[PDB]
Design a protein around this ligand. Structure first.
Ligand SMILES: *Cc1c(COP(=O)(O)O)cnc(C)c1O
Ligand SMILES: *Cc1c(COP(=O)(O)O)cnc(C)c1O
Ligand SMILES: *Cc1c(COP(=O)(O)O)cnc(C)c1O
Ligand SMILES: *Cc1c(COP(=O)(O)O)cnc(C)c1O
Ligand SMILES: [Rb+]
Ligand SMILES: [Rb+]
Ligand SMILES: [Rb+]
Ligand SMILES: [Rb+]
Ligand SMILES: [Rb+]
Ligand SMILES: [Rb+]
Ligand SMILES: [Rb+]
Ligand SMILES: [Rb+]
Lengths: 431, 431, 431, 431
């Protein structure tokens, strides 16, 4: 049983609580799209873990690679270069758009956003950062100052020069220009305000192409392009955080490829590592050159470490061969349609959005009012669990709870249909 | 050859420069205390990589463990608990001193210091942090605000409430109380100043037991104890950063065990992972309880991930069995004596300090004046390389260049004597 | 002549330039609504100096009072109390609304706003201040951090916790709620944003009832009342800056009396001193009590100084007897109608707003587009001068230049008609 | 009686408490070196009010001048120039040292320091300010961030970039260089620390030549000169706050004349106004030129106002003719010797320091230990009052209470001897 009293004793006495609440089970092993409890029960992993397991759990190629390297090249002194590093950096250069040339290999998502934000502050000579009011960029220092979806209170003052703008949200429009939702004019209205408060030191803007934690909020048409143009006019860099969206998850290698807007700095994470701690920043030669002349510094213990780099190369080799970026669109369409059927069935589902395998279902009390369904989401989530479907819900102010759906890129037709079922039952039994 | 033009082409075109300068070689494989270039040449790794490879490179047990886990349990959703995590947390509870009860498993050194600093700001209700003027705590946001050895200019303003005090330095004493170096009175003098600038929100103090980047600066006798008492009187927490010192490196499990002063939060990193990206924070139940009631949040992608935790448990199992903490003292004494012989031989060596396998040699122009030897250090370092000894030098203002010596805990008698030789030759041929 | 070369020599060699540009004349003497140059030429003072000379220049009663006191009671030690001080404090208590009980007598406008902002930060235990994006609160430290109409760039970072919201502007509406300008919904939209960025330390809001520097922008109907309610809900104080509006200028003793919303702290200045350096803050006993228990401190050289207090009492005695608050409405209506006639005559006049003797004329290229008239304003201002009418124009982004009209409360029917003429001629001859 | 119950009622109900405690008396009139209560009792004003009444109270020339101007030229629009202003600016240029060329006329002490600090931040392009740990520069925003003697807690965070250094204190030496108090080495030690924390944006240093609030702490020999040199090396401006020291009070026009070190910006206040609200900043043409090109702005209601300027010119004309700067040295020597006699008599007096008519007596328990006399100071102060001597005591941490003695420059031989007596009696009757 998952009930092992010694286990839970030790967990209650020696683990620090960092947010949420531990599942009441012991994960014993994982494979593909499933995780197994102590009882042998398979739970269908519909969130790719913490939105990272792009190739699923324990993908045979990742196992080989970790193998070949653990006993060959593990960790090196920060100044020593090695093959996996140079190959990964190069590979990233070729698959990202033209304009993205040099990478820096690191460990976490927030570490990558910090490195990005520090290079832009160096390069520009300024320090003000702007982000969306429902963003998620990390727990560490600067990543946490541009984060607005959560953890903003009780921990002291934020970094100086921190500003936020509202994210364009179609589901629940708020800004209106002559009859309809004018997200571009909201953008201009927002920027006018920033401009009025800036002390003259705008340095960059970080943006998620799709706000994950913020409730799977997809940036509307023509938005990025217009955002990039606001940055251009002020001398600001545009950092795109593709931590949940890069590596095929939305039907393109990088979400920035859809819109056709290449950022100044692109940050990768979750999906790059496929479950491991790997991360990177990709930038243009021009910026890198400039950062180098001014003395840019981002030295860590794990920057350029063989193992991880080696893993990341494989992730990309697999994605490439197996053409998982296309699977993402196909499977992605399969999951979406089903979701919409569910919607036909139940009034609680108020919206289904996202792209490829990065979908979002917004639970609501009633479509007309579009009133948030208080605790119905927790029910659904509890029910899912009992049936063996691991989901995740995010809940923000003025919104209904949103389920984040992000199955592996390697999900099967069956697994998809399965989850779609469990989801149905859980919802049925929850009202 | 290490000369492979395609390699270097790609490295020159696609890598971001983050500090220092890449070695002009290609590391092909690593094992034990050596790294091998493209030519098959073995370079004796006298810095344990980036001061992490406590068990050396590719330690057979670490290879097994990475193996058993890559294909079993890799990465899980942040709320799911698993065995390696609970066992590691528990193990840490038992080996750290009484008073340290609950841990939080993470990925990097700076991530761990951030989590520590955020919990202290939560717990206390304040935000001012004090650190040494020659500290190294990380590149990320808050870790970078308490860092003073480097990267402090050109990247904007630091976090609000940042203060520093001078570290006690015996080698080059500066504060004098009636005839001699009064480090305790320096401490009091320093704290009076802080107290005069504080806005009334002192929350914590981060301190390295031995300042690594700051030139292997060991905190003198009775210092910690007195520091802890300054914190106690003001309501401040004491966070000890044992990133380079924990896990036996100085002859004790944790350096804090020597002085007999248990901190409020203890942070681990480099040596915990033994080369991998693992890190943690260890705290008292009382603080954890309190942080939990106030809503403490430190959610990342890799917090509580099977693989890494699993690795870390092994590191500690090995250390424990092979009694590497004692080897550290024995080998540690062997290296030290030799270093002192060198000192007899050459006038440039102005000081040899540190503890166990975490030694420091301070190059100087002449013992009397104790004048820093300008670029002689670079010579020595260049010469070492040619002979196959990988060393590392740090150079700060008002100091001579300091070689950081930190061979693996598994170093042999031979390897030690060998390095000691190469070191001699390199120094001989450099003047 | 005003041309005196020795004069201008000395002025060019020894005066620091602080903004704008010195008039090319020497004011030799002043009386009533006029100032006289070196040539004896009378210039009709249509701005009451720097919007302060509520009783005009050299009002016989102010001359007596300054007389009786200069040789009797001048300046005292900050702890010594005297009659003029206690009487002024009391008088202010009786004429301000119920709820405003205790005053603090000071010297300048920005000094008063600082004292207000520091008491609110003390009282609340927080530090975030919110103000309008086109506000003017002063040059000193905190007053300057809540100022947004100007001087915001090139002088370093602003105080931490500084935020701004757009002021409701009817002339050039920007926020739209279903067909029309919804200033209340703009308010809510604005506050949602603040709420999203706050670190949980909102302490107060400073607001001008009518934004003077911001282009005579009158806060629309039901606005204050709704603003006060936003503050109430968050635990924030409301500080009203009646520096240009208090003391009858808008047809009420205090502008806050119109709306019927009493602030938490009310700040007075310009009009209180009638040209001298006097200022004050008026607060509720409850807040004062509380500030006192927590150790509130605002000690200056001139706090509670006989002379000034004495002057201020007279200003108020005169206003009261001569019923200048009513004259303000009557004369105020006379000036307004004329202004509107002008408007009929010339297309450049795009709007005439304000209240009582605190009017604003917005120069524009053409009513339809409502395009700002580039430099036509400077013409008009130059022409006025030549004809002997002293005016003042403010020009902000996205607006046309606005003439601030604020003649003394003692202005005559004739003087008004006169100015109205000169104004006509100047405008006629300027296009 | 001073007891008038209506008075005290009104004072208890309508005055805001700003620090200290009101004297329990009603000052009815003042003249020369005395203030008179309601009972007609003359109290000898030994603090020149709030250290401002350099010519005493109600000096016949100041009365004429206030007279000639109140009914002639009072307050003008900020862009209009007038004679008293240009003459005052010029006069200041001629009497200050070579190198100080252009002035800006304002109202208060803290307003002047703000204007100074904002010009240095503009001119340099940086924002860090350094001051002494026992300084007093004002209550307003930036003046308050460089103030360290008091009001530093409970009102939120200070301005970013605020640092302090210890003031050189001979009475209670703390830094020691080989046997003795090495204030210059303290200076260097201090600056090394600043340098280690600076983010690379040091802009200026504000310093009082003699720390008044800090306990009449005179900057030791060769100090200023060395301070100025520390600023020179870093690109920092030196602002001297001569608010209590300028205008002859220490035996020179300006204290900076003693040391022979001309500052970059000199700030005047208290003594310039002689009791009124006048203040100014004096700077070099080079800085002014530069500030002007970059858009320097310091526009207030009272900048360049006839009345005050007019007063200030007279203050200086009187000082000049009556040769009060010399009287200051003569009377100054008379008061000092007497003080020292007192010292012979009573063991409580532990030190008598200062210069000219700006003296300080440090009450202590016993000369050997130099232990601060707890509440003996309050006794002495209470006793003085009863005898009719108005004194003032400041009390800081680690110090004994210090009496600030600063009689008018016009004090008579008799008045001096008188005070010296009362002082004796008060001290006698207090132990
Ligand atoms: C997960 C995530 C991060 C941070 O990654 P970590 O590994 O947790 O530091 C940053 N940004 C976004 C948008 C993320 O989704
Ligand atoms: C290496 C180090 C760190 C940071 O570890 P990273 O993995 O680089 O983030 C922090 N503190 C000390 C004292 C270190 O030596
Ligand atoms: C003029 C003014 C002030 C400042 O008064 P000063 O005497 O210049 O410091 C502050 N607020 C408003 C709204 C003003 O119009
Ligand atoms: C009194 C004083 C001030 C401030 O003058 P205020 O008129 O109170 O603003 C500033 N600095 C020093 C050194 C002072 O003594
Ligand atoms: Rb590395
Ligand atoms: Rb590219
Ligand atoms: Rb995890
Ligand atoms: Rb323990
Ligand atoms: Rb006073
Ligand atoms: Rb009232
Ligand atoms: Rb003026
Ligand atoms: Rb001069």
């Amino acid at each position: 049983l998952n009930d092992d009293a010694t286990f839970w004793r030790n967990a209650r006495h020696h683990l620090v609580r960092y947010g949420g609440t531990f599942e009441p089970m012991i994960i014993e092993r994982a494979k593909g799209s499933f995780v197994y409890d102590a009882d042998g029960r398979a739970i269908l992993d519909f969130t790719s873990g913490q939105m990272s397991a792009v190739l699923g759990h324990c993908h045979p190629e990742i196992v080989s690679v970790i193998g070949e390297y653990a006993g060959k090249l593990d960790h090196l002194f920060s100044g020593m270069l090695s093959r996996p590093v140079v190959d990964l950096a190069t590979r990233l250069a070729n698959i990202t758009p033209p304009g993205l040339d040099r990478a820096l290999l690191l460990s976490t998502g927030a570490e990558s956003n910090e490195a990005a934000i520090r290079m832009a502050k160096l390069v520009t000579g300024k320090y003000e950062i702007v982000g969306f009011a429902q963003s998620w960029h990390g727990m560490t220092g600067a990543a946490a100052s541009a984060t607005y979806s959560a953890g903003r209170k009780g921990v002291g003052p934020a970094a100086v020069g921190s500003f936020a703008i509202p994210a364009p949200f179609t589901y629940r429009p708020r800004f209106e220009r002559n009859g309809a939702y004018d997200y571009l004019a909201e953008l201009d209205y927002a920027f006018d305000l920033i401009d009025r408060q800036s002390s003259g030191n705008l340095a960059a803007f970080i943006a998620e192409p799709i706000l994950s934690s913020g409730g799977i909020i997809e940036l509307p048409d023509g938005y990025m392009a217009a955002l990039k143009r606001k940055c251009e006019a002020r001398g600001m860099l545009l950092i795109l955080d593709e931590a949940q969206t890069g590596v095929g998850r939305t039907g393109t290698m990088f979400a920035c490829q859809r819109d056709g807007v290449t950022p100044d700095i692109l940050t990768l994470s979750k999906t790059l590592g496929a479950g491991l701690p790997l991360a990177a920043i990709v930038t243009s030669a021009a910026i890198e050159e400039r950062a180098h002349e001014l003395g840019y510094l981002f030295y860590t213990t794990h920057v350029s470490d063989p193992l991880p780099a080696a893993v990341g190369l494989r992730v990309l080799d697999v994605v490439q061969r197996d053409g998982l970026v296309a699977r993402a669109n196909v499977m992605g369409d399969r999951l979406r349609r089903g979701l919409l059927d569910l919607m036909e069935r139940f009034d609680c589902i108020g919206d289904v959005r996202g792209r490829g395998l990065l979908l979002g279902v917004e639970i609501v009390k009633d479509r007309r009012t579009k009133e948030p369904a208080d605790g119905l989401g927790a029910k659904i989530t509890r029910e899912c669990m009992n049936l063996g479907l691991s989901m995740n819900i995010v809940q923000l102010p003025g919104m209904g709870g949103v389920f984040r759906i992000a199955p592996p890129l390697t999900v099967s037709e069956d697994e998809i249909d399965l989850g779609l079922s469990l989801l149905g039952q859980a919802i049925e039994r929850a009202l």
